[PDB]
Amino acid sequence: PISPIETVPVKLKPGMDGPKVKQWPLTEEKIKALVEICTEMEKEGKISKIGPENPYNTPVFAIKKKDSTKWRKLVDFRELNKRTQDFWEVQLGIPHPAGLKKKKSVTVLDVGDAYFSVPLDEDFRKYTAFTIPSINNETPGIRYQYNVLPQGWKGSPAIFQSSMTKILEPFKKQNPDIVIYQYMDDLYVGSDLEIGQHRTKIEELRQHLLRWGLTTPDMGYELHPDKWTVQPIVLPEKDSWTVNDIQKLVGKLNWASQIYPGIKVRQLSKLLRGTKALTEVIPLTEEAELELAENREILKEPVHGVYYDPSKDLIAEIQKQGQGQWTYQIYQEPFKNLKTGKYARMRGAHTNDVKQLTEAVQKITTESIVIWGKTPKFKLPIQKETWETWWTEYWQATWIPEWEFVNTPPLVKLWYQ
Amino acid sequence: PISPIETVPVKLKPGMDGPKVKQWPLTEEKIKALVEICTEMEKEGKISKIGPENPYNTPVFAIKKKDSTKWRKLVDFRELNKRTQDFWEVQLGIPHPAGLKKKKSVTVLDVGDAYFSVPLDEDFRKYTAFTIPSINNETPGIRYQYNVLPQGWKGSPAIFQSSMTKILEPFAAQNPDIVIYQYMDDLYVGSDLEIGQHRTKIEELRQHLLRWGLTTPDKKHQKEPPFLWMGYELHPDKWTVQPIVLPEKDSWTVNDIQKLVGKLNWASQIYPGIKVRQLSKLLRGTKALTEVIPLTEEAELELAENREILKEPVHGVYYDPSKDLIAEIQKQGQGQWTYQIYQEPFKNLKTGKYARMRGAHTNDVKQLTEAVQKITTESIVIWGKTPKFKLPIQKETWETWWTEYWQATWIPEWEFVNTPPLVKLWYQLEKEPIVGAETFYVDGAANRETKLGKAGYVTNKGRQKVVPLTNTTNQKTELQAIYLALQDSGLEVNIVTDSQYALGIIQAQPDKSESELVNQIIEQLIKKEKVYLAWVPAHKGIGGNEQV
Numbered sequence: 030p031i032s033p034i035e036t037v038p039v040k041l042k043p044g045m046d047g048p049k050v051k052q053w054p055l056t057e058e059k060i061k062a063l064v065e066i067c068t069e070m071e072k073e074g075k076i077s078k079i080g081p082e083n084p085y086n087t088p089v090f091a092i093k094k095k096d097s098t099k100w101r102k103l104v105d106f107r108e109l110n111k112r113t114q115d116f117w118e119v120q121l122g123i124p125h126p127a128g129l130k131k132k133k134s135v136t137v138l139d140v141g142d143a144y145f146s147v148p149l150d151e152d153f154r155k156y157t158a159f160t161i162p163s164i165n166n167e168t169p170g171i172r173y174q175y176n177v178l179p180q181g182w183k184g185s186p187a188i189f190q191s192s193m194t195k196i197l198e199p200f201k202k203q204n205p206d207i208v209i210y211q212y213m214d215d216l217y218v219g220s221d222l223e224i225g226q227h228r229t230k231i232e233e234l235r236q237h238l239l240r241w242g243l244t245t246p247d248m249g250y251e252l253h254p255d256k257w258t259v260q261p262i263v264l265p266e267k268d269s270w271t272v273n274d275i276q277k278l279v280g281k282l283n284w285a286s287q288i289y290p291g292i293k294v295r296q297l298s299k300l301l302r303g304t305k306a307l308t309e310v311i312p313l314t315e316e317a318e319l320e321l322a323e324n325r326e327i328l329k330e331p332v333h334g335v336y337y338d339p340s341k342d343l344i345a346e347i348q349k350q351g352q353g354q355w356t357y358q359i360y361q362e363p364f365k366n367l368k369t370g371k372y373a374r375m376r377g378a379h380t381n382d383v384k385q386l387t388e389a390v391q392k393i394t395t396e397s398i399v400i401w402g403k404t405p406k407f408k409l410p411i412q413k414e415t416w417e418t419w420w421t422e423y424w425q426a427t428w429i430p431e432w433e434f435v436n437t438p439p440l441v442k443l444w445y446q
Numbered sequence: 447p448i449s450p451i452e453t454v455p456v457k458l459k460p461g462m463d464g465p466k467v468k469q470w471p472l473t474e475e476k477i478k479a480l481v482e483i484c485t486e487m488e489k490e491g492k493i494s495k496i497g498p499e500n501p502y503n504t505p506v507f508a509i510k511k512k513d514s515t516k517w518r519k520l521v522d523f524r525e526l527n528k529r530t531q532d533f534w535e536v537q538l539g540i541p542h543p544a545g546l547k548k549k550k551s552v553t554v555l556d557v558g559d560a561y562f563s564v565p566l567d568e569d570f571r572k573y574t575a576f577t578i579p580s581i582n583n584e585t586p587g588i589r590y591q592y593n594v595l596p597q598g599w600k601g602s603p604a605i606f607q608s609s610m611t612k613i614l615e616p617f618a619a620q621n622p623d624i625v626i627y628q629y630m631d632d633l634y635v636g637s638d639l640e641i642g643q644h645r646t647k648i649e650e651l652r653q654h655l656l657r658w659g660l661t662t663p664d665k666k667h668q669k670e671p672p673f674l675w676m677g678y679e680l681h682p683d684k685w686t687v688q689p690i691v692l693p694e695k696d697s698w699t700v701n702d703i704q705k706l707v708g709k710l711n712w713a714s715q716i717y718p719g720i721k722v723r724q725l726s727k728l729l730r731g732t733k734a735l736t737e738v739i740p741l742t743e744e745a746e747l748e749l750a751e752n753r754e755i756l757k758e759p760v761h762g763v764y765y766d767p768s769k770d771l772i773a774e775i776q777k778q779g780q781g782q783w784t785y786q787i788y789q790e791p792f793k794n795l796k797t798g799k800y801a802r803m804r805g806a807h808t809n810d811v812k813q814l815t816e817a818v819q820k821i822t823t824e825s826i827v828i829w830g831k832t833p834k835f836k837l838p839i840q841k842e843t844w845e846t847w848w849t850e851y852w853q854a855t856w857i858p859e860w861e862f863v864n865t866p867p868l869v870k871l872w873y874q875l876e877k878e879p880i881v882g883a884e885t886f887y888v889d890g891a892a893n894r895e896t897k898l899g900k901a902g903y904v905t906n907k908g909r910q911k912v913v914p915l916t917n918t919t920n921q922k923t924e925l926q927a928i929y930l931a932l933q934d935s936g937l938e939v940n941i942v943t944d945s946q947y948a949l950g951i952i953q954a955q956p957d958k959s960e961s962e963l964v965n966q967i968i969e970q971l972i973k974k975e976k977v978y979l980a981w982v983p984a985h986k987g988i989g990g991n992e993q994v
């Protein structure tokens with residue numbers, strides 16, 4: 030299009046070089062799709078081919094977007110983000126509303142295309158370099174860099190922030206109770222309205238954004254954050270117990286003590302005094318029921334001294350509970366949980382583990398965005414190469430959270446369900 | 447000059463300057479030998495005699511080759527190389543022959559004087575300046591600099607590749623019928639065109655390259671198949687590795703073991719069944735560089751097996767995109783796995799092997815999954831697609847495992863081929879406590895100083911045992927307790943342990959390990975009809991009976 034004004038100068042923290050990150054091998058299918066997409070973007074001026082004097086590289090992937098049958102290009106900007114935006118969450122930083130999580134419904138719209146209009150600083154372009162790989166190393170890859178604000182770069186909405194504010198200004202005046210937060214390429218819109226009125230208002234915002242030149246490609250995607258809390262730990266309830274069941278109970282309670290220190294197991298541990306068969310039925314005493322009940326009412330009331338620290342990173346642990354169910358905890362420090370939850374989707378065996386874990390990660394990340402305005406670093410119960418191979422199949426989002434892989438779970442599986 | 451090729455702009459690293467290293471040395475013997483070079487290079491426009499102002503400098507040596515009739519100039523660019531901007535990396539990996547498509551004809555062209563045929567960015571040229579010295583007596587040295595890509599300069603390979611690509615494009619644009627692979631200096635062209643028109647096309651490419659200043663073989667066709675390339679023999683209808691030579695020695699050296707397992711690993715690409723385990727297990731000790739390392743019986747046996755495998759030549763085929771990609775895996779039994787990738791029954795695209803050398807405990811199913819992953823990765827790299835799998839495991843076994851497994855696992859289209867040995871779970875622990883079974887409360891402990899320690903059990907039937915141990919740790923004692931309870935119980939047994947370690951090893955359901963203890967425990971668990979392992983927190987007085 031045109032440069033409406035000059036470019037916003039982009040800088041890196043002094044003493045920091047550009048991203049150099051190897052490109053993952055891709056299927057011929059994804060390579061072809063990337064070739065088409067990038068050819069079209071090259072014809073539109075969005076990206077340009079570069080020479081060998083550009084050392085930098087950033088990974089690219091091909092995803093199906095959400096429900097669509099056509100390919101989308103997804104650039105992994107995490108490294109460039111760490112090397113730039115960490116100074117740009119200050120200089121250009123976008124404030125995060127603490128009322129968004131309190132709304133009864135939150136709809137997510139994709140505003141990314143808006144970035145393609147605005148030019149990028151000439152000096153900074155070389156840092157956006159990416160490579161379309163070739164099969165079997167037959168040729169060196171096809172190399173491009175961005176001439177416009179790239180999607181996935183956290184600096185893009187930071188630069189486009191003023192324009193977005195100006196565009197959203199009229200809508201906010203006619204709708205003062207609607208909360209609108211911008212995270213990367215997405216717009217989160219909260220309301221207390223009835224589902225129908227909420228969707229009507231969302232379509233109003235869509236048409237408003239559309240008549241101002243901002244296109245958006247929009248069950249549907251909508252959240253309900255008012256139900257989001259830290260789930261209580263549950264003790265198994267049975268008519269008649271056994272030695273084994275009581276052992277499990279004492280174990281789980283003793284584990285829960287690391288969270289809620291005011292738990293006393295002394296009575297339940299006595300209930301089996303001598304060496305006994307695991308299947309031996311032990312009726313609980315009065316003191317045993319007293320202590321179990323005293324440990325129950327203390328376990329349904331949330332912890333003390335748990336607050337979100339903006340300085341520390343968010344950490345999300347996920348464990349596989351079997352039968353399509355997964356449990357997760359979001360925490361800054363060990364044993365202090367900011368959020369916990371459980372995810373399950375759909376049966377029929379059409380689903381597999383990797384798909385479930387991927388959708389779970391996406392959901393947890395979206396929750397974390399709505400709540401704290403930033404993404405947690407995941408600890409994934411999956412083999413590294415497996416994940417790195419199959420994650421782009423089911424990935425529907427425009428952002429990539431940080432992650433690592435955990436090889437050492439204990440029995441904590443059934444303690445979290 | 448060589449101007450028609452567009453120069454690539456180059457900068458020095460931020461906050462640096464061209465190399466100022468001054469060289470007076472050394473000798474009069476090689477000096478005029480250097481002038482005889484630099485004159486002919488100056489005439490060809492590759493270098494230029496430079497004025498007195500603002501020079502930097504770089505060391506220059508002269509040296510000779512065998513069959514001495516031609517001398518050679520050598521410049522050490524190390525400092526300048528340190529001082530120049532990073533460039534996009536030249537290709538790290540090379541194309542794998544198993545991923546190449548069969549073409550009716552293949553031609554290998556090699557451009558000579560490659561780097562010297564590509565101009566260097568003007569403003570940067572002053573940093574390549576080198577000086578031919580003298581005997582003095584009021585004789586300032588002869589000064590030069592490069593107008594082209596200097597040999598040994600950091601930017602030369604990348605800029606050459608770029609230039610070659612751009613030069614190739616107007617040709618390849620008008621010739622989609624033929625395909626040109628570009629590797630270092632060499633161009634490998636191939637086509638399904640008839641031999642005559644193929645040859646004519648090759649000559650056209652040669653002339654096109656010659657107009658850009660890039661020389662190509664004028665004698666015969668040059669290389670004829672094979673085609674010994676990067677450690678391969680490339681035949682028209684087949685590919686193979688180089689001839690592999692396994693040396694025989696009385697005294698094996700750590701370096702020689704390195705080279706040995708190197709050649710064997712390389713051989714595993716094509717020759718199936720190669721086992722690298724024992725010979726590398728020797729190398730597990732990384733100590734010094736010169737250490738003479740004695741063989742083990744298993745290692746000599748392994749080397750012998752490999753020698754018998756390498757007895758006869760084996761050739762792999764090329765890839766046909768119209769045919770399915772099949773991968774087949776077999777277990778070698780030692781924790782070693784082997785696989786073949788083929789579109790056809792009697793011809794392999796390639797082969798390979800997988801081994802888990804990390805961690806003490808694992809099982810066959812998990813290892814099979816890992817191998818499948820490695821093969822999937824390799825296949826995506828080479829052919830750009832994932833293969834159909836033929837696996838020595840049954841649907842029930844794997845469904846059971848991955849449904850019971852804590853990690854998320856992924857498996858593609860795969861079918862059951864019944865080839866012994868099959869992959870199976872040798873035992874399964876009970877998910878619920880057994881009724882009518884003796885309950886063993888087991889424990890073990892050790893002194894971390896004396897290491898003596900003990901292991902034992904107390905049952906609900908009133909039975910008790912305490913066995914003293916020597917040279918052990920709390921881990922070993924705690925596992926020894928479970929083993930002890932497995933020995934003294936019936937076909938159905940309930941075990942209660944206070945340790946997360948032992949529970950962790952057993953619940954992982956390993957069928958093999960690096961510990962004889964864990965192995966014996968495995969054999970016992972296999973012999974048992976029902977085993978229920980349960981855990982309780984220690985020092986809580988839940989009926990576990992301990993000692994110190």
Ligand SMILES: N#C/C=C/c1cccc(Oc2ccc(Cl)cc2OCCn2ccc(=O)[nH]c2=O)c1
Nearest residue numbers: 546548549552554625634635636675680681682
């Ligand atoms: N130095 C040295 C060469 C190195 C070299 C390395 C890689 C590829 C290459 O040649 C090829 C070039 C392009 C294509 Cl589409 C296939 C090729 O098939 C190669 C397989 N082949 C080889 C020879 C022949 O007679 N027929 C064939 O189908 C040459």
